[PDB]
Amino acid sequence: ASTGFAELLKDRREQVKMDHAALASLLGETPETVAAWENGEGGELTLTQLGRIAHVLGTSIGALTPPAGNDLDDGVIIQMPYYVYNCLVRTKRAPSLVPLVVDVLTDNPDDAKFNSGHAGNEFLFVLEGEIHMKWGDKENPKEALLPTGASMFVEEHVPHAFTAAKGTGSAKLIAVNF
Amino acid sequence: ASTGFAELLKDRREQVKMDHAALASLLGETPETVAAWENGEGGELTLTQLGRIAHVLGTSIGALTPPAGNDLDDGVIIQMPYYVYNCLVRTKRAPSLVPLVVDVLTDNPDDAKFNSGHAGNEFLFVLEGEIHMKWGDKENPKEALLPTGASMFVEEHVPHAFTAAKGTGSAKLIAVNF
Amino acid sequence: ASTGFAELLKDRREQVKMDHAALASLLGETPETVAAWENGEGGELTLTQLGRIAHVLGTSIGALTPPAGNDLDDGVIIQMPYVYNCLVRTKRAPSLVPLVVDVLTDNPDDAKFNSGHAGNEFLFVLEGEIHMKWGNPKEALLPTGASMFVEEHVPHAFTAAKGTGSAKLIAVNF
Amino acid sequence: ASTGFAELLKDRREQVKMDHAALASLLGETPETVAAWENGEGGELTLTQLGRIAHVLGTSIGALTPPAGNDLDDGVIIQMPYVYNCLVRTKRAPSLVPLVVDVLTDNPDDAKFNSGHAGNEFLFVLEGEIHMKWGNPKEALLPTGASMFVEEHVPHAFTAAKGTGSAKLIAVNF
Ligand SMILES: C[C@H](O)CP(=O)(O)O
Ligand SMILES: C[C@H](O)CP(=O)(O)O
Ligand SMILES: C[C@H](O)CP(=O)(O)O
Ligand SMILES: C[C@H](O)CP(=O)(O)O
Ligand SMILES: [Fe+2]
Ligand SMILES: [Fe+2]
Ligand SMILES: [Fe+2]
Ligand SMILES: [Fe+2]
């Protein structure tokens, strides 16, 4: 984080044609301190201070910090084996990827509590049982009965909810947010 | 396609400050014909001709044609239920999404024929049996044994191959390219 | 175009697990015809036909066609020297449209609005003084040397300052 | 920053099915502390600590922090008027760095190279004549009014034409 910030900070400062002294003057620091940050010593900078640094450099904290990181072994990562979520493999190389095996333990559609929508698309596959899906306007939603083997796609932000089909006991589906 | 091209063409032409006559002069057409295209009559234009139109407008055919389209019902789309691929739900709103249930009928790892890699990331989940996965350099690859319930992530372009574990008969996995 | 399409078609087809025959039936074509397109023989396909091919493959025409192309000389392109005088453009950055605009009207009371662009815009006052209007509009009198940024979709108009005759701006859309 | 982080933290946490206690244990914090961060009280978290929070949540610090912000006035920002004279910039388009460069060296034999930028660059010769070098370099003598495009990462240098004293360019990085 500190090494990444060090590199990114120096890139942005040079990009806006500021020297150490110029940047220091806008941040209540000495140019020696800014030089220190560009040397990896920014580790203890606060979120608040980071916001100010991003601001004077006309950018975001995100632009001054390193990407999530690489946790892959030559391109891949493997994970061994009302609602219980069994989280599947995730990776910093694709942060929005959140795959899950969901056991649905309520078979009363009236218990379907709607989301407000997701950032990111979602793919679903019914592994066991039958699912009663609802989506859209929670006040008056669309509905579908998804039997085992059915597959579904839910676009970003579309609110949804589901339970197992009425009186069918329980259902299991795999849900992949990407 | 014609209506979309009509709108996009007129947008680009105006964006580069060209009038009908100017654009027509670069394409061996009359300005009336270009006006016609911007009126939805470009339907019979050839791929070759489209390439030339994109070229003189300093852009790509893609920039002059409409996006894939919307096949969703209020945000969602549902599909009812050596290798056999059972294609799951797809959508033009997320073209790169290609989910599959793969039945692996060869349990001889020596039969694993490597890919050359995918455009797009890939999430996998072993539904049945045990999978013998290989990835990377086909000449000397990485390998892992994925039992039922295991989940895996393969980064874009990483070549891979798989069969069921030696002498285990057959395996089944769900593979989601996104 | 034909060769780029041949490569992208094959890739997409393989991507959706379709063999020549599978794709051909959906289009009402023979499998040899599809093989021919992937052999670079798709040059005469019409826009409408491309739309059908993209549709059955669940994608766009753009996803099956090559990028703009490269017109740079080792990464560079140069151009030697209301009236629009178009500056250098490149297929490597299509949305870049730099211009030298001659503003020949100096009656702000009669400026006309450009309902907004798709894309941001950077401007620099080359000569004279400009009277800019945007967004009961927001306004600004801008002397030579002044610079400005206009966000995508923001409507705006320009005129030379009241009775100053004319002015020049550099406008860079990107 | 604190409020943006509070919102993004909660969203990401919910996204990975973690309740306050689940996230707190991984960080060696109490669940009340996490609740406090989502209550906008994360202002004093250090860069290193943010790195740990992002790590356990399998994302980047950037994904948990707000966008640059808005400094426009109804979509517009203006700026009234080798030496770099910085023109208008905006947090709504951070990579836009327009400049008026005073080229005070007129000995091409002694130009020095900028090993390439991250991002494209558009240039326009304001005054005098420029001697550009890029990429045994490629070269070009550019009179006033000439314009040019330099693709990302392409090394380049500028000097006024041999013995012409000085020149001025407008360089727009985007
Ligand atoms: C829990 C929420 O109500 C449903 P999810 O997050 O699985 O989409
Ligand atoms: C068939 C190829 O060899 C493997 P896939 O396309 O499932 O990744
Ligand atoms: C400079 C101006 O932005 C040119 P217009 O938008 O009116 O085409
Ligand atoms: C105009 C030039 O591109 C400025 P530099 O790249 O040398 O910083
Ligand atoms: Fe969901
Ligand atoms: Fe694959
Ligand atoms: Fe404009
Ligand atoms: Fe440069």
mmCIF file of N, CA, C and O and ligand atoms in Angstrom, chain B residues 115 118 122 160, ligand 6:
data_model
loop_
_atom_site.group_PDB
_atom_site.id
_atom_site.type_symbol
_atom_site.label_atom_id
_atom_site.label_comp_id
_atom_site.label_asym_id
_atom_site.label_seq_id
_atom_site.Cartn_x
_atom_site.Cartn_y
_atom_site.Cartn_z
ATOM 1 N N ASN B 115 -6.475 -25.611 -24.356
ATOM 2 C CA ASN B 115 -7.064 -24.478 -25.061
ATOM 3 C C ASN B 115 -5.863 -23.654 -25.463
ATOM 4 O O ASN B 115 -4.729 -24.124 -25.435
ATOM 5 N N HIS B 118 -8.883 -18.094 -23.060
ATOM 6 C CA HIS B 118 -10.150 -17.428 -23.357
ATOM 7 C C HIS B 118 -10.016 -15.942 -23.265
ATOM 8 O O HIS B 118 -9.113 -15.412 -22.614
ATOM 9 N N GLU B 122 -13.053 -17.022 -16.180
ATOM 10 C CA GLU B 122 -13.906 -18.194 -16.087
ATOM 11 C C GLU B 122 -14.000 -18.752 -14.676
ATOM 12 O O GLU B 122 -12.990 -18.985 -14.009
ATOM 13 N N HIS B 160 -6.096 -23.876 -20.656
ATOM 14 C CA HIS B 160 -6.421 -24.949 -19.721
ATOM 15 C C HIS B 160 -7.062 -26.160 -20.387
ATOM 16 O O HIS B 160 -7.459 -26.111 -21.549
HETATM 17 FE FE FE E 6 -12.488 -22.518 -20.603
#
